[PDB]
Amino acid sequence: STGSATTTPIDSLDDAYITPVQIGTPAQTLNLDFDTGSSDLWVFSSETTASEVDGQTIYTPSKSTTAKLLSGATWSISYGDGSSSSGDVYTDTVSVGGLTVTGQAVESAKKVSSSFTEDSTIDGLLGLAFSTLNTVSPTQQKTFFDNAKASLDSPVFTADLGYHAPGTYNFGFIDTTAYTGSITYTAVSTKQGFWEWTSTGYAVGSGTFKSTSIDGIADTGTTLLYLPATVVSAYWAQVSGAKSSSSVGGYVFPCSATLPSFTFGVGSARIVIPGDYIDFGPISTGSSSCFGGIQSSAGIGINIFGDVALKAAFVVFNGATTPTLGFASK
Numbered sequence: 467s468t469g470s471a472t473t474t475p476i477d478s479l480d481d482a483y484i485t486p487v488q489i490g491t492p493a494q495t496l497n498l499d500f501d502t503g504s505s506d507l508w509v510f511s512s513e514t515t516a517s518e519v520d521g522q523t524i525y526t527p528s529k530s531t532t533a534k535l536l537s538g539a540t541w542s543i544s545y546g547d548g549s550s551s552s553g554d555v556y557t558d559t560v561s562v563g564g565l566t567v568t569g570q571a572v573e574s575a576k577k578v579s580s581s582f583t584e585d586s587t588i589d590g591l592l593g594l595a596f597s598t599l600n601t602v603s604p605t606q607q608k609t610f611f612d613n614a615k616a617s618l619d620s621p622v623f624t625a626d627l628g629y630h631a632p633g634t635y636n637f638g639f640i641d642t643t644a645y646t647g648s649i650t651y652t653a654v655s656t657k658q659g660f661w662e663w664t665s666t667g668y669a670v671g672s673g674t675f676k677s678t679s680i681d682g683i684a685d686t687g688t689t690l691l692y693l694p695a696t697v698v699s700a701y702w703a704q705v706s707g708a709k710s711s712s713s714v715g716g717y718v719f720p721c722s723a724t725l726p727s728f729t730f731g732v733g734s735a736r737i738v739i740p741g742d743y744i745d746f747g748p749i750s751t752g753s754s755s756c757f758g759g760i761q762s763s764a765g766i767g768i769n770i771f772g773d774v775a776l777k778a779a780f781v782v783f784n785g786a787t788t789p790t791l792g793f794a795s796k
Contacts (some may be wrong), residue, residue, distance in 0.1 A: 467617045468638035469565025473500065474565070474625065476587040479746055480773060481659070481689050483627060484587060485635055488561040489572060490530030496589035500635055501687030502625070502661055502783065503770075505599035505609050506543050506562070508551055508573035510582075511588035520576050521586030525574065529787030530567075533558045539576035541601045542572045546688065546766065549581040550742030555602055560610060562592075565637050567614050571600075571607035575791070591687070593625065594783070599659035611785060621785045625686055627777035629743055645794035646789055650735035654789040658768075660685070660785060663791050665771075666733060668693075670701050675736070684776060684783070690746070691728075692763035693743050693772040701728060701760050708758070714749050717758035721748060728760060730775060733791040739778040 473485040484497040489509070496509055508523040527533035533556045542552035553576035560570040577591070582588065595602070597608045615621050618638030626644050627633045634644070655662045660683040665676040680693065698717065701707040704726050708719040719725070724742030743760035759774045782792030 467565055467637070468619055469561075469563035469614075469747065470636045471563030473635050474632045475628065475630065475764065476585070478630070480627075480630060480777065481681070482588065483633070483773070484589075484685070485562070485592070489525055490527070490558050491532040492530075493500045493561070493750065494523075494525055494530065496525060498590050498592040499588050499687060500592050500594055500625075501685070502594040503683060503685035504543065504545065504591065505593040505595045505597055505659065506541060506573050506601055507571065507590070507592045507610055508541065508543070508575055509552070510554070510573040510578070513553060518583045519581050520686075523589045525572065525590075526576065527556045527558065527740055528571075529682075529755060534570060536602075536605075539571075539602050539605060540609075541603070543601045546770075548581045551575045551578040551582060562610065562637065565614055565618075567610055569775045570610055570613055571602060591649065593629045594686070595661065596659045598656070598657050604784065612659055613786060614638075622648055623783050623785070625776060625781045625783065627686070627773055629740075629777050634775070640782060641765060643775075645796045649782060649792040649794040650732045651782070651784070651792045652732050654761050654791055656789060660768075661789075661791055666731030668697055668731065669729040669736075670704050671703075671741075675729065675731070677731075677742045680730075680765075680769055682771050684781060685770050685772050686776060688770045688772030689774070690770075690772050691744075691760045691774040692766055692768075692772065693760065694769065695762045695764045698760055698762045698796045701726070702758065710762075714755070714757070717747060718755045718759045719758055721756040723756070730771075734794065737775070737793055737795065739775060743774055743778060774794070
């Protein structure tokens with residue numbers, strides 16, 4: 467089997483991407499944030515505290531003939547941005563882009579934090595990291611991908627995120643028309659439950675490539691590119707007037723600037739992030755100070771190849787017995 471679903475930016479900054487997912491019988495379609503940095507599939511629901519729902523579409527298990535309470539199971543998750551959610555668990559049929567899993571754990575939110583309530587476009591998350599990070603207790607649950615894997619033509623999914631445009635998540639096949647050149651594969655460590663890999667270095671604009679190992683995670687659920695302070699300082703030093711602002715919470719730059727590209731290494735291959743991808747616009751409405759898309763990972767504890775980086779590539783998440791990550795230009 468295979469699946470193929472279009473993913474669409476939630477706003478004009480590509481802050482996140484939503485992908486329609488069918489849950490239950492008859493189908494209830496919710497728009498979920500596919501997150502390769504976490505491992506819970508959770509949704510706004512008929513159980514979510516009413517004051518914490520503001521425009522989201524909810525899953526109502528009592529209207530699904532295939533829903534079953536997973537008795538005694540609870541979940542609770544906290545994300546890198548400080549947001550959180552928790553609740554109880556149903557199993558139900560879940561389909562993505564024509565690919566169906568029966569008995570998928572669908573985590574029903576009883577509580578969500580403010581950031582989720584305030585984002586009316588995101589009806590929940592679909593985690594695509596390794597199932598060892600799943601938060602369901604006392605019986606840990608599998609991700610949609612892990613459940614689908616044995617049925618897939620090939621044990622892979624691919625992320626093809628657009629810049630200010632829709633893109634695609636495919637399951638079970640590699641679309642050879644979706645990228646240019648060849649795919650370069652690189653080793654993954656699953657020790658922390660992430661799609662963790664080591665970049666071979668970077669370049670700023672037309673500058674020379676610096677060979678240096680940068681361990682980090684491929685995380686579709688993080689907007690920006692978070693890298694070591696040394697690397698980030700070298701980038702912003704090439705932008706007149708750019709500075710790190712503690713009041714704003716990161717690097718800002720004059721909105722009048724033209725940003726340089728940023729290149730990252732994948733083995734001997736190179737992925738180029740155009741300068742425009744690094745512009746996240748005015749810090750507040752009407753400001754002439756703009757927020758940067760490359761930020762320091764210092765104090766996160768991990769480097770994160772978020773959407774800014776991933777959208778510059780066609781990315782293969784290879785979930786074979788020895789997992790690997792592939793990157794191609796597109």
